[PDB]
């Protein structure tokens, strides 16, 4: 086949290539490359040029995906747009290999198990070490953004909130239950370690089966975390730059740090130790992906090019359109 075609998926309308066949939702769709017979994943960027925040993310997602190359990080097979000219170029689609299902769904159906949980987390971390060594920050590691196939292979998904690590980044980032405390206590100045926090909540969730810190709102999330990691010293919270965070932590009781083994019922000793090292409140003492991998937990399993880069709604739209057409499979 050749050309394009349109279809009613859920509530949305897609205009994929004629070759990509039999679409199925999972917004992302699972199609089949008519040319080979291999299942594929097609992601439609939802109105990417509806704002500057949306455009910026769309371009960042395309760009990082086009750059990164790792066995544990999703890759592009094709990227296209059914818009023939820059003038009416409203959207574009990303094509990645179908990876089975996401960790979130996988956990809802079945309980994992020691060997499995280890293998999966090892992979999250190699993928992370790569993304980080490359100077990139993910900002959204959660079960739903981690794909796992039949052979238990994993690939980190969704770079929609990712970017190149810098000193002062955008504040409201990471999905709440996987959001590290400093995203709020240290508004706009968190680091790549936030992704280690997310990996800890994720690893913790795989073991227990329950969400580790299920908070009602961003501030309440702090309380949920604190109930486990204890609260920081009172003199520290006094000097907090963020008013919102300072007031909240002030009214909050004075909680003590609980032993992790007391929470993780049937978890292993080394697993508890690693988690303890990943979920430390102090971003600095918090283990890195490299260090994480080096841990005795990953015993039975034990260089990169930094990403580089350089606006109006039409500037993002144009800069993006260029990166779409310059794609080589
Ligand atoms: N390559 C893939 N293979 C299999 N499933 C995939 C693949 N890419 C994405 N998915 C699925 O699509 C769902 C959402 O994908 P995602 O790339 O995170 O888009 P998103 O809509 O921006 N998600 P989010 O911002 O977290 O709400 C995932 O939970 C997976 O089921
Ligand atoms: Mg997702
Ligand atoms: Mg996204």
User: Major β-sheet, in short?
Assistant: 5 strands, antiparallel
Major sheet strand order: 3-4-5-7-6
Task: Report the C-alpha radius of gyration, rounded.
Answer: 21 Å
The CATH superfamily of the largest domain appears as: Transferase(Phosphotransferase) domain 1
Number of structural domains: 2
Helix fraction, binned, reads 25-40%
CATH architecture descriptor name of the largest domain? Orthogonal Bundle
The number of helical elements comes to 11
Oligomer: monomer
Question: What distinguishing features does this structure have?
Answer:
five-stranded antiparallel beta sheet; alpha+beta; globular; binds magnesium ion; Phosphorylase Kinase, domain 1; 11 helices; three-stranded antiparallel beta sheet; transferase; binds phosphoaminophosphonic acid-adenylate ester; 2 domains; monomer; Transferase(Phosphotransferase), domain 1; 329 residues
Walkthrough of the structure:
The protein has 329 residues and is α+β, with helices and mostly antiparallel strands. It contains 11 helices and 12 strands. The chain has 2 domains: 17-100, Phosphorylase Kinase, domain 1 (2-Layer Sandwich); 101-309, Transferase(Phosphotransferase), domain 1, CATH 1.10.510.10. Helix 1 packs parallel to helix 11 (313-325). Helices cover 36% and strands 13% of the residues. The site of phosphoaminophosphonic acid-adenylate ester has 16 residues, from strand 5 and strand 7. ATP binds at residue 43. Its EC number is 2.7.11.24.
What's the structural blueprint in terms of helices and strands?
Elements: E1 7-8, E2 13-14, E3 20-25, E4 28-33, E5 39-44, H1 52-67, E6 78-80, E7 93-97, E8 101-102, H2 103-109, H3 114-133, E9 136-137, E10 146-148, E11 154-156, E12 163-164, H4 182-185, H5 194-208, H6 218-229, H7 234-238, H8 243-251, H9 269-278, H10 289-294, H11 313-325
The site of phosphoaminophosphonic acid-adenylate ester has 16 residues, from strand 5 and strand 7.
